[PDB]
Design a binder for this molecule. Structure first.
Ligand SMILES: [Cu+2]
Ligand SMILES: [Cu+2]
Ligand SMILES: [Zn+2]
Ligand SMILES: [Zn+2]
Lengths: 153, 153
């Protein structure tokens, strides 16, 4: 299997470790881990285009979107490659993440490795918000923590 | 023109930003930027295999070595792909890095994106130290700072 990992950090208390595993190059990627320090509720979760943390999360650029589609949720046909939807934090501020996605990959010319994973302030509306910002970012607010997705053993 | 970037951080004061540019695929990669907080003199500078910062720099693994060679300096045919030799810090503790290397790449099998750049405690002996450690790590000592190399624009 191909594996990757990401350590999420920011200016506040949000931090976490997210793991990625892809058994076959043309198969789905399992994404799992935990993020703490979040307000209870939904938080947008995206792969942004650049693995550039020189300005913290601010330098990561827009959602990763090599196919030039509009913003959506992970189960929508119309979505950015980087659209991983929402993670849910419990009353203790911990979001346990455990999903599978068939659009992102850990290899090939469009691979998320070397790009930035970001967890957001607010819920991602999955492009159903009914305004221009919705079909661009999902209105998920500020970038609370992020990290570069790296190759793992 | 392919570009990558890395923010170096550690447990101590060593920090900086290193840029990578490769005008042509399979062409040389220019590596440049500024690292501060170093002791004056030489410091080993390598790409390590894993972009895993879960345990700080320790989890980066060994030098990136897809061809299973012994450790050397960047000018040697016998070297790891990740062997970028030394960088030099001035009397103010600043290393104004400027390296050109044709063995690392920002694409293909020798791609370093998604892996970890590490700057070391001591000089890399470039495989000339006459012990087993020299042909593994260059005897460069501890990992002072590191970061995952990400895709840039
Ligand atoms: Cu995002
Ligand atoms: Cu090293
Ligand atoms: Zn999106
Ligand atoms: Zn080496």
């Amino acid at each position: 299997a191909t594996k990757a990992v990401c350590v999420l950090k920011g200016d506040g208390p949000v931090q976490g470790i997210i793991n990625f595993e892809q058994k076959e190059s043309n198969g789905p990627v399992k994404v799992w881990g935990s993020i703490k320090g979040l307000t209870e509720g939904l938080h947008g979760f995206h792969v942004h285009e650049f693995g550039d943390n020189t300005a913290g999360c601010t330098s990561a650029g827009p959602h990763f979107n090599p196919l030039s589609r509009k913003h959506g949720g992970p189960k929508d046909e119309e979505r950015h490659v980087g659209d991983l939807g929402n993670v849910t934090a419990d009353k203790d501020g911990v979001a346990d993440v455990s999903i599978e996605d068939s659009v992102i990959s850990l290899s090939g010319d469009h691979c998320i490795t070397g790009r930035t994973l970001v967890v957001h302030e607010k819920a991602d509306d999955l492009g159903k918000g009914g305004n221009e910002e919705s079909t661009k970012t999902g209105n998920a607010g500020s970038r609370l923590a992020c990290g570069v997705i790296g190759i793992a053993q």
